[PDB]
Amino acid sequence: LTYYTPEYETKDTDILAAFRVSPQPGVPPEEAGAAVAAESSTGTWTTVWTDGLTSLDRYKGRCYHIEPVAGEDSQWICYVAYPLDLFEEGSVTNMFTSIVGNVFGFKALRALRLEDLRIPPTYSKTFQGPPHGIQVERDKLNKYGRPLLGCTIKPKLGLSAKNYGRACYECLRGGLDFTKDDENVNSQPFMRWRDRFVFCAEAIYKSQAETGEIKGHYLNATAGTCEEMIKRAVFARELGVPIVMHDYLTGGFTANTTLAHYCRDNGLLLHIHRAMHAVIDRQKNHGMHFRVLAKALRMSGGDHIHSGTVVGEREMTLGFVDLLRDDFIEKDRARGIFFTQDWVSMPGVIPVASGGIHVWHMPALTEIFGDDSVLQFGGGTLGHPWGNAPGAAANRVALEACVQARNEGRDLAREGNEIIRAACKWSPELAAACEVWKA
Amino acid sequence: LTYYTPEYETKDTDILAAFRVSPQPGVPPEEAGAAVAAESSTGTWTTVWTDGLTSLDRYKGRCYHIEPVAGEDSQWICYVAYPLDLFEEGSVTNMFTSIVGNVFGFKALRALRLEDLRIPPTYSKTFQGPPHGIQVERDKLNKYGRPLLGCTIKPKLGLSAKNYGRACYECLRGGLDFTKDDENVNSQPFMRWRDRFVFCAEAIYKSQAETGEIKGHYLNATAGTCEEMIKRAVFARELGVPIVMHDYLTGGFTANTTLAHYCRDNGLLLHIHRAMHAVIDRQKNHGMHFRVLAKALRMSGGDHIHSGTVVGEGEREMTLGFVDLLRDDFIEKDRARGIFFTQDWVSMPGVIPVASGGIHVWHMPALTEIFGDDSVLQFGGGTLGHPWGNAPGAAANRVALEACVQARNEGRDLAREGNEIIRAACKWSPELAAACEVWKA
Amino acid sequence: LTYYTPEYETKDTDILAAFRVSPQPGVPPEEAGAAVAAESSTGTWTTVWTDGLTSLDRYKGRCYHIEPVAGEDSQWICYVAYPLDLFEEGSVTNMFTSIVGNVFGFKALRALRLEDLRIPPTYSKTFQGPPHGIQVERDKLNKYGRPLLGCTIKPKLGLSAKNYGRACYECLRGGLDFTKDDENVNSQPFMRWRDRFVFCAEAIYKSQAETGEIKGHYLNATAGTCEEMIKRAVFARELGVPIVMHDYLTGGFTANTTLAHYCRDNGLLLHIHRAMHAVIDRQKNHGMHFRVLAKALRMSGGDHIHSGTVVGEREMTLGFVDLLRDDFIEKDRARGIFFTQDWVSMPGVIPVASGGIHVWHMPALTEIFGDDSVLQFGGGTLGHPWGNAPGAAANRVALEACVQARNEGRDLAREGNEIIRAACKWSPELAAACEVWKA
Amino acid sequence: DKLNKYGRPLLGCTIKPKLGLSAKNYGRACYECLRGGLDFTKDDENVNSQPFMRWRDRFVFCAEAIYKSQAETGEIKGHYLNATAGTCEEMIKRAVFARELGVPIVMHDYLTGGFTANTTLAHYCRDNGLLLHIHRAMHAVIDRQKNHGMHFRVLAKAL
Amino acid sequence: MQVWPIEGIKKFETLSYLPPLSTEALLKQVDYLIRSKWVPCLEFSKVGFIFREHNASPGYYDGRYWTMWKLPMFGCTDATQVINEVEEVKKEYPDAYVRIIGFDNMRQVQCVSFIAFKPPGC
């Protein structure tokens, strides 16, 4: 119908969306695609006289292209173009409201997934973006030429604030750049946030003074209200520490954007955790792919973002890691990049890999993500038989051995086990880590 | 040399500048344009090792087109492209610093004039623009289908605040939409601003109650400091009045943008006066053409801007061109109207142009024809000089305007029939008849 | 006509203006002069009844004197007197609005230039003036008996904030008093202002600790809005650094005056850059001479002001440099001083010379400006073959050699090359600078 | 107790010339007086803020002098920094900066500034731990003649 | 290519980038003060440089003041008198820095400062 316009030339100011559409039986792709377009824009069930007070064509979403999905006889990618004027400047909230607010409940569809968005420069330039971004962060921390290393403190709940800070000091002093608050750790009966912030600050400053290297702890500012979130960031600011944390999907985009602005204004790095993402991004037929949530974070603002474990599909991960880090990313269907994306010098976000990784993963992780990444342990440090500081040292040594080998021209994919084995000869900490975890 | 790149294709994100370049004798046009590009961007008199820490090609202004000027000898139009990344978002101040901060002093140029700027959407979307703009203003004031009418209270200085407000009430009640503070009227010994604001408010509300039409007075918030400027806007807000005023070139762009934000935040219309513009925009060979200053105001923020007198001033097509740049969403390249670049404002609202300076009832047909409805026609002597005083003077102007609008709408040609339209209205309007005997056409 | 009053005795409270008037053919100087006077004051095209509610004579600008310009048969200087009551106290904005707001568009004139203003004491005493001024600045910085030395960092755009601060530290440590933000450097995608302020502060404090001498960097506070300008000054204040910068013509006088007040209240020096001045002050027949813009700056407030290169006309420069620095300046037509100017103890402003200068210019610059000046390099430090710190040392040595020689009674205009040559014998840094730049 | 000074009169010196000096030259004279064994130096009653010595400049250099002399001698030092001003807002701005600098004592001319202002300043000084030195400029206009006016003991009780 | 040193060459503002001034050269600088009708004065210190110990707000530094040696030499017409006092300080305070400053009673300020003696060993 009138919302399927296959001859439309997209404008350089349009927001474009690629939807994976699964229509009900009997519903051709073209009116499914047209329904997505009309339902996520100007479509309404009966005619109305106020339409004649404007030019509706100027606000129509249009489905301008449809292609089949490989391996499916009832799934299509439908491309939809939305005019720039639909969107409130600087608001990820309004961008999602306008595009995914209504159409996922349409009855003629069995399922619907948003795969990708083309964010035009005219729109992305209305956002702050990362408080600092990759390059500024490396300069502030004086850290170059290797992935950054972190550890999440466990048990997440259980410890007193003091015992919690003790574990942080021991991790940091052994060679990790950062320690982190579990996503669940906000403020709770046996560890109130302000107590935790004081002891973690003592730990950060003790470990930095001991090692000579800059240290941080991702202090979780996630809270029930905006007022509490900002109170937490304000105290971190008072303590002079370098980095805070936010759970951006459960706290939400309005709060995240507020926090990103506060962090820009006060020189704080912002570590973003993606709790609840798999509620939305797991199933191939319905929801939103994480690369959409990743672009939205880059716009709303964060300096780090959790990006997986890669220990999903390699090519898809590599795809949205480029979308997070790079200035210009060309369309590349093999890597899940449905649109060419130009960020016109908005800083990039450092991807963070976490979840069940130990020293034997270091070659693969270094090879996959390269230097601009955070490798985040949590079990792989606190599970070392000699304790946290040696566990940290084992991970730092393994990483630096991989970086040295890579820089020398050695292939990490083929020689990683040998690289690690050679380092075990002079690092008893690494040797010990290598016999507990096996491969 | 390396800054002349005639095969360069401009990016949709580039800021483009059109310069009228007058080189010294013996300086080739290509060197001049290259110099304008190098001296308004990266050009440094010796090599520095730090250039090796970056990629300077990325930040170079480029002269990509040069052409001779017909009417002259030794004058060229040079086009320069500037990358988006040079510019601070939302800052007209930085845009001018970057483009016109240094190059006008270059030895190898006899003279330099900036004629036009292509402001790309990617940059203009970082600016609020007008607090309200043409359409919102009409809706707020419930005024449609005609130019708005105003009068500047004179003498600018002399009056007590009370005698000043009396003159406002009598103008407004006679049919003007607005009265205005002269650009020189800020706060002064014999008329302090807060006193003026009180008496002008009394007059606005008295004239509004009497006529049934919404009235305003452009209360000048121009001040020596930002804090003083905002104190004045804050008291206007307290009084509940619709419109304040700023002199954006003499107060400056940093202050003007601050005020524009305040007016958006508090529902105040913002009338912009262009005092001092002719210091920089008068001479054909040096300075900045007004259309550049007009685009900058649209970006920084104003709801009205003074745009000339276009009658007996300057050339018609040039006025018509920058009035389109001020009001329209999309303005196609048109050198006959001094539009050097296609300009796309991506739904930034427009600014109402204001005509002033020495106009009377016999100009009403020509003024209506040239500017059309979306304009303010701003009198002074043409209201306060009526032999029966301010209210009959205002009425004479309002009658003359409505007779012009009626006739236009009926299909009559204002350019050829104006005097006849006016003389017909004199038969039933004693106020207009008395005006027409004093001034002539 | 009635606005040409050649018998008028100027009042000690009048503001006086000297206009260079170029009338249209057929327009005698007297009605041109009278038109300037009436058009920049009470003149209006038709009579009005409200004139009878006051005494217009009391607010009339008057043309009280006319003289021919040397070498011109159609150009005159017209002197106009404006009453004190026309002007809002403390507002440069209103002074320019009232005097140059309207008259430059008058049709009977071909061209018009404002050459000079007599600012009476009654009016200048309503202004703060410089936040500190020459004497206070020398006392605060503990710097006496020589010109101050600075360097503008280049490339203006290109560098990361960190790489930018690196260049600042190397310049400062070699013997410069200051480094400076390019006029274009405010806040931009690859170098956001707050990042730049942090790294420049690290650099200022490292170089000061290394050398033992007080150091500063002119941190540019120029911004799109008053709120942003002040946010930038507030952070400089937090960092405890000595000096900030403003582009006073492009930021504008209302903003500048606000910033000058903030700097007085918080002990910050204010470096003023004059970007865009040549749009106004270049052409001899139209605009405003820089000495007008210079007086206006002294009133609005700044502690330094860019004043040229003198490498224009010597006598005109010397003229407005006196107007900027001295308490009392007698009328002196050879030096472009049209009016005797009495500043009744308002502090002076330090003139800054910049633009393409190197060690061989040091004798001439020292001789022209004397001690109360800033010599600002930018190419002449970053272009030294041994890098920034040696380039700075070369400039500092050349300057001190010139000062020593001058104090000994030697003539810098005649002996400068010998003075510099003698210093090359014991300063390898200077010797190296002297072979790259040649004269 | 605050100054740790017992068993003798305290000693001070008023800097002269009252007007003439740069703020820096003024602070130099303060340092030299204090380092030689005086407890305090003082701002002349006329010294508030004036063209050749603005108050905030004077406060910075006098603070440098107070802290240099205290570090040299080992004894607590102060300078009576004059907060007397044209308005309440300016008077308090001056006391607020003294507070920031951490110095022990400020000054007020209580008869020419007046009692409403003085009482305001006395409260600010209680709330912020500042000593308050009171100068009695203009008292002899009121308290000199035996037959008319007010005796200084009245003005003293009021203070 | 020579590297600018990072240690051992702390500075004392004007003329301290020159080789240390000989007695002849110092005399000429003092003569410049006298000819200018400026008043010479000596200062001295055991600490050579600026620092920040007691406050760090804008324009506040410690170590700007040194200690005055005797009094300004009002009416001095003989540079040798100044240089002699420099030797007296050196005698009483062998490990003190000494500088010569100058007072302008016309613009009412200090207008000169330059190093006369640095203790070797420093």
Ligand SMILES: [Mg+2]
């Ligand atoms: Mg977790």
Ligand SMILES: [Mg+2]
């Ligand atoms: Mg006017």
Ligand SMILES: [Mg+2]
């Ligand atoms: Mg520059």
Ligand SMILES: [Mg+2]
């Ligand atoms: Mg006394």
